[model samples]
Target: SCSMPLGMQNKAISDSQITASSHLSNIFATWSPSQARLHLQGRTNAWRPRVSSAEEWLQVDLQKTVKVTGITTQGVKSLLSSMYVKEFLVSSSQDGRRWTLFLQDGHTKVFQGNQDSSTPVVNALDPPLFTRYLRIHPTSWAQHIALRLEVLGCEA
Candidate 1:
């Protein structure tokens, strides 16, 4: 069977389930950690880092360990700004403290991110990851790095 969506798009995941390393301080209401859910729109769309660099990351806690099969991402767009992640690395943790980067073969896997703000890009994990916490580390982006995402998986 195909992996079902874990619910950021449907609001099954609550605002408290999402978090980030840092958020832009100006408009916390619109660009905060809670705004990182996938399929969100309008003024509150995606999550942006306070400082655009590799040190920042967006995190999602599934609340419980699950078999994660895929991940989907979308860039952010507005009247005056166009931003999106071009490449990123995925990390997973069962206990939040001990994390592991998703590996392809023996090397860390980097997922191809989005092109436009609205278009969604999906990456299926070859062996899947079983974890409760997941983090997205953006490596490259356009203009700035902003993201919205969802995890696909099933109850373990």
Candidate 2:
């Protein structure tokens, strides 16, 4: 389960695709649900929601349980002021009801942060995670968070 920042290698699931809860806005006809994965294809289109708010979030359903090792995220390129995850929480669930916080090497506080800049933020889940769904619950941000994100690990 190697993740990426180049040093972190690619995963099997990544080759197929990733997903988002919604896409916020568009530039003519660009911003769509796949915009997050688009960046991986060198497409750079962003995925968010029509309304910008904290309750809004991005999601990736691997569809089946897998060992998720890490995550990477980026904000929109054009709009700088409103789309960074200042602090966020990741949860892994078998049935999407009983969720455990995605730990920081087994610590309780899994709260992680990101920058408003375009530099992608990568968080490697230590021990990896096994679950059917990977959901990111954003806590705080520069404004409200909107993101383009990815989940990395083995698909088994």
Candidate 3:
């Protein structure tokens, strides 16, 4: 069987399931945390963090634990075409409090993000993860920490 998207693009994920640490403040009326969805169409299609910092993060609640196989990330298309995350860390938690960073060979992994605000980047989790909550913490970005993403997985 093939792994399927767990819904960040399709609305099966629900707006309430998406969240972020902070967003650009009219801006708040448009770039709400819930707006972070891959392929989501609009001028403010992705979630824009309040500031460019490593402390900012975007998160999603799977609603139920699933076997996450991969993740697809994209940048928000703004007038400048420079808003996007460049590098980030993935963290997962079954209980949302005790978090675990994605690792490779006993070391933490920093997933490469987008170069521009058009192409979507896919990062496969070779070992996969079984959890309900996932978070994307940006370490670097092109201009702003704007992001859109989807989780790929199978039902447990």
Candidate 4:
């Protein structure tokens, strides 16, 4: 598949419009943006692994399968929090356990996140998607890697 770029895909469906209702507790058990938290505003950034690994992931349960247009993640402002999840993978699933790459690394497209980027960016899937679960796999980072993520789209 392809990607929407490292910046906000578009201004149509904004952060306030999206909501990642719930997710699994962070593996480190120190973040708030987990399945335990409500719409992620700006607090704990919800999830962070002690060590960055491909297996360590953040899974969001949409409560029910909803039409999702895209996603955006908040990074630390820097100075205080200087690192970020530079590169990551976005996946989707109908059953909580089975996942598929919504975007991939191939000739037509190579999914590379905002490497070492400390700014918020969006993945506005042009066609949108219908899935009950969404997962993010952090592949790389700058200083530290974590996410305060927002998912846009609705029941409509």
Candidate 5:
């Protein structure tokens, strides 16, 4: 009795005030609750935190070309205090195999202190470029740390 898009509309139900009224119709009864639960579960593991040593680098496969815009770090209180991490580097790749360094901050020293003392750095790239992989190489500090990478681009 309700009129809607093909994905929601059903046959033999149209123009009926009680059955097809737009105000009170359960058109999405076909959506399975199990499917919705699966979607929510999948996102739980998407951005899992990873920890590594100063000598180790965290490599992320972009799976496709994407433009990177910014990066942020959290829980760095433990790592930033250490002298190991002198700076951070951001790199990119086209095939997820070969990488090219786009931004490197080695000379700039980061000290351990309050959150306000930590500086958030932004990429200088304007309009952004496409890449398939990203790597964050730590020059010094290593310990309990969290980071978020923000990339802006059309998936290619």
Candidate 6:
């Protein structure tokens, strides 16, 4: 992953390097520019653990300065109808300790499906703010699990 860089020791190469390392370049070859932009700070996987209630949640760090405005998902067809998220909360922070909710919305019938080709889901907040990390909480659901977040915004 371009986001994960290995330690380098060569002084001359280090100062002129455009990227962190050649390893990142190889990983980046697999993704398009847009997909790269949506990448989150976690290993890509099949699904998240199932949750019984609103309190259960998952999180990931933004890992860089990004101006978050909205989010999108892919291959959501597996989401069971009986189980659904009530809402998602987008919070931001500089230190990852103190956080503020940037936006939140309840479960919608529109979000129930693969949503692979659906238009981008816009955040409810106006004038998107910049941050270094973000946390997403699925406030409700059952049975099915797993989701990918496409954060919409540019690097700050």
Q: Which candidate is the best by TM-score?
A: 1
For candidate 2, what is the TM-score? Answer: 0.68
- Candidate 5, residues 1-156, lDDT tens digits: the string is 111111101212112210100111145322111111101222211111233444444454445555554443322222234212335555667775676776335443232311321333333343245665655555444432233223333433
Q: Candidate 6: lDDT of 108?
A: 29
Q: What is the lDDT of residue 146 in candidate 2?
A: 56
Ranking of models by lDDT: 1, 3, 2, 4, 6, 5
Error of 6 at 144 (Å): 3.5
Give Cα-based local distance difference scores for all models.
0.87, 0.61, 0.86, 0.55, 0.34, 0.38
Error of 2 at 30 (Å): 6.9
RMSD after CA superposition, every candidate? 1.4, 4.5, 1.5, 7.1, 18.1, 11.8
- Candidate 6 CA-lDDT value: 0.38
lDDT of 2 by residue, 78-144 (tens): 5445456677778777875676776555675455667764667777877677777777767776554
lDDT of 4 by residue, 60-101 (tens): 666677787777765554346655666677778888777777
Candidate 5, which ten residues in sequence have the lowest lDDT sum?
16-25
- Candidate numbers sorted by TM-score from highest down: 1, 3, 2, 4, 6, 5
C-alpha TM-scores of all predictions: 0.94, 0.68, 0.94, 0.64, 0.42, 0.49
lDDT of 4: 0.55
Off by over 4 Å in 4: 1-29, 35-46, 77-81, 104-112, 115-118
Model 2, global lDDT = 0.61
Residue runs of model 3 more than 4 Å from their true location after superposition:
27-29
TM-score of 5: 0.42
TM-score-wise, the better of 1 and 5 is 1
